[PDB]
UniProtKB/Swiss-Prot annotation:
Subunit text: Monomer at sub-stoichiometric copper concentrations. Homodimer at higher copper concentrations. Forms a heterodimer (electrostatic interactions) with CopZ during the transfer of Cu(+).
Shown stretch of the complete protein: 1 to 146 of 802
Location in or out of the cell: Cell membrane
Binding site for Cu(+) 2: 85, 88
Organism superkingdom: Bacteria
Other facts noted in the record for this chain: The copZA operon is activated by CueR and indirectly repressed by YfmP.
Full protein name: Copper-exporting P-type ATPase
The family this protein is said to belong to: Belongs to the cation transport ATPase (P-type) (TC 3.A.3) family. Type IB subfamily.
C-alpha cells in the first residue's frame, strides 16, 4: 500500500520497567498515527512506530513527558559545509529529522548550522557524519568544547 510509517528509537528514564513502560506504550497507542508502540525495557529503549502525518515525533516525546518521564535526548549543535542552493539544508533537515533516535533536527540558514536533537546512547556523531557523507555533504561540530582545552 502507500504510507511510510517511521520508527523512532529513543532512551527514556524514570521507567520502573513494567507498568510504567506499558503505560507509556498504551498512552501512545491513544494516538491515530501510532501504528505500533514498543519499549525494549531490557535496554531501556522506547521504540514507537507511526506515520509522520498525523502524530509527530515532537508529540510522541510530549506524550512521554506528560506521562511523567524524561527522554535522554540532547540538542547538539553542528555546522554544515555542503548547503548553498537552499536545497541540501532542506534534505538534510528531512533526513536528520529521524535518522534513528533523533527527536528533532532544525536547520539554520543564518549561520549554516543544524541543531540535532537526538539520543547520544542510541546513535553518535560518527553515524551523523556517515549519514551526511551518504547525502554527499560534510558536517562539522559547533566547537564541541567552547575553548575547553586545559591539558
Amino acid at each position: 500500500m502507500l504510507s511510510e510509517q517511521k520508527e523512532i528509537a529513543m532512551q527514556v528514564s524514570g521507567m520502573t520497567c513494567a507498568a510504567c513502560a506499558a503505560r507509556i506504550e498504551k498512552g501512545l497507542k491513544r494516538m491515530p498515527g501510532v501504528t505500533d508502540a514498543n519499549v525494549n525495557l531490557a535496554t531501556e529503549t522506547v521504540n514507537v512506530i507511526y506515520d509522520p502525518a498525523e502524530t509527530g515525533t515532537a508529540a510522541i516525546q510530549e506524550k512521554i513527558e506528560k506521562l511523567g518521564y524524561h527522554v535522554v535526548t540532547e540538542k547538539a549543535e553542528f555546522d554544515i559545509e555542503g548547503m548553498t542552493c537552499a536545497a541540501c539544508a532542506n534534505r538534510i533537515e528531512k533526513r536528520l529529522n529521524k535518522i534513528e533516535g533523533v527527536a528533532n533536527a532544525p536547520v539554520n540558514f543564518a549561520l549554516e548550522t543544524v541543531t540535532v536533537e537526538y539520543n547520544p546512547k542510541e546513535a553518535s556523531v560518527s553515524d551523523l557524519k556517515e549519514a551526511v557523507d551518504k547525502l554527499g555533504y560534510k558536517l562539522k561540530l559547533k566547537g564541541e568544547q567552547d575553548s575547553i582545552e586545559g591539558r
